Design a protein around this ligand. Sequence first.
Ligand SMILES: [Mg+2]
Ligand SMILES: [Mg+2]
Ligand SMILES: [Mg+2]
Length: 529
Amino acid sequence: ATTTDELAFTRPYGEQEKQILTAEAVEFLTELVTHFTPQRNKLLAARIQQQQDIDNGTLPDFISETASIRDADWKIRGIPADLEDRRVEITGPVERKMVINALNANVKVFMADFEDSLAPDWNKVIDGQINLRDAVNGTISYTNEAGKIYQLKPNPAVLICRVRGLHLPEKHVTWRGEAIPGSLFDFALYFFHNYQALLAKGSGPYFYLPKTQSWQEAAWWSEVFSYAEDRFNLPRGTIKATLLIETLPAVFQMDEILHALRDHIVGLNCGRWDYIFSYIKTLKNYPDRVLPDRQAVTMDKPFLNAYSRLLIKTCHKRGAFAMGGMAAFIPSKDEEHNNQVLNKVKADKSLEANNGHDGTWIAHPGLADTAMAVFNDILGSRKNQLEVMREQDAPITADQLLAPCDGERTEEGMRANIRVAVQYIEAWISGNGCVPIYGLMEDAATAEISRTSIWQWIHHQKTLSNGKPVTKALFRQMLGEEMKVIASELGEERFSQGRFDDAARLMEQITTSDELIDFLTLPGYRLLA
Ligand SMILES: [Mg+2]
Ligand SMILES: [Mg+2]
Ligand SMILES: [Mg+2]
C-alpha cells in the first residue's frame, strides 16, 4: 500500500462540488485528514477498551488522577460578545428554506445540523455547505413553487454548525482507501468557507460537537481547532465550540473536557434521548440497570436531575454556559389548539431556568416566543445565569448518576417505540433525518433510544408489566402488527409508495441482533448513495 498524503473523491464534480471543494479547500481538508485521522482512529479504539472494562463489571466514576484539575480554580478562555446571550436556540437541518426560517425565528442562535437531524446524503452535505456560506454572507434566499420568496430579515440569529460525530465516516472521500472522518469534513468546510466573513461582521466560526465520550476526544478537537487557527493566522480561541454531554461516559469527565478544550469551549449541553440511549449502551450487560419505558424516563427523575445540576455547577465554576434540553413539539397554526403543548413547554423550560440553565432548545419557530418568555421572565435584565453556582448542592456521586429510575416496561410503550422508530427510519433512508412524527420533530436519537430500550429488555429477558416475556419473537410479532397501524394512519398511497418495508427490515436487524450495535446510522448509511 502507498504512503499517500492525498485524498480520493468517489463522486464526479458538478457545479456544487466546484463551489465547495475548491483546490484550496481540499488542500486544507487534506492536511486535517492526514494530521488527525490516525489519532481519531486511536480514540475509537480506546472507546472499545473502555466499554470492555465496563462490560466486565467496573462501573464508571470520576477520574482519580485528574483531581488536581477539578479542585483548582480556573476558567475557560472566553466567550465572544454574540455568544453571551443564548437563552433560546433553534436546531434544524441545513436545507435551504429551513436555514432561512430558522435564522429568521425569534431566537438568539440557530444550530445548523449535519448530525442527527440530517440523513447525510452527499448532495445534502454539499448543499448544506453552499447554504451556510450564503447564510453567513447574508444572501441566502429561496423561492417556492407558489412564487413566495424567503429572505433573511435584518439582524438574523447567530449561526453555529453541528458536525457529525467521531464515529461517522464520510464515505465519498477517502484517505489510503478508508473513508475520512465526517467530523473533519463538516468542520473543515464550514470553517474554511466562512471564517473570514464571520469574523469581519463581529461573529466567528462556531461549532456544536456531539457525542463526545472523553476528555482525550476534547483534547483532539482542541488540536484540530488550533491547527486550523494557526493555518490562517488566527489568534488562539477564535474557533468556539459548544459541546453536548449526551453520553454516560462524558458525564464523569465534564471538568476535564472543559479543561482540555478551554481555549475554544463556551458551554456544555444537557439532553434526554442520546444520554439515556448511551446509559443503556454503556450499562448494556448489567441486569440491575434496566430502564423502564423511555417515555417515563423524564428529566425530573433523580439520575437525570443529578446530571442537570452537576452540569450546571461544573459549567458555571469554569465560566461556561450550561444549556438545557429540547422541546420538539410542532404547534398548530391555530393558537386555540396549543394550550396543552405550550403549558408543557412553560413547565419544562421553567424547571430548566430555575435550575440555572443559561438557555434552552426548540425545534420549531412556533415555540420561540413562549420559550423566550420563560427565560426573559426569570433572567430579568441578566444576559445569562453564569453567576448561579449551585454552591448549596451536596456533592453529586456516581451512584446517584447511575441509579435507574422507577417506572414500568409496558406493551403500549414498546409498540409506540416501534411505530416511532420505523417511521423515523423510513424518512431517514428516504433522505430526511428531521421528521414530524405524532406532533414532534424527531431526530435520530429518538429512533436510537426506541430500538436500544427494546434490545435491553430482550437481552436481560425482562417481562412487560402485563407479564409477557420480551423476546425477539414477541418483537417480530409486534413489528408486523404496528406496520399495519402505521399503514392505517398514513393511508394506502403514502404507505405503499414509502420505504416502510426497508425501514422495518433495518429496525428488525438492529433490534434483534445478539450484539448491541453502537449506532443505527452506520448500517443505515449503506442505504444512501
Ligand atoms: Mg504538518
Ligand atoms: Mg492547545
Ligand atoms: Mg444528540
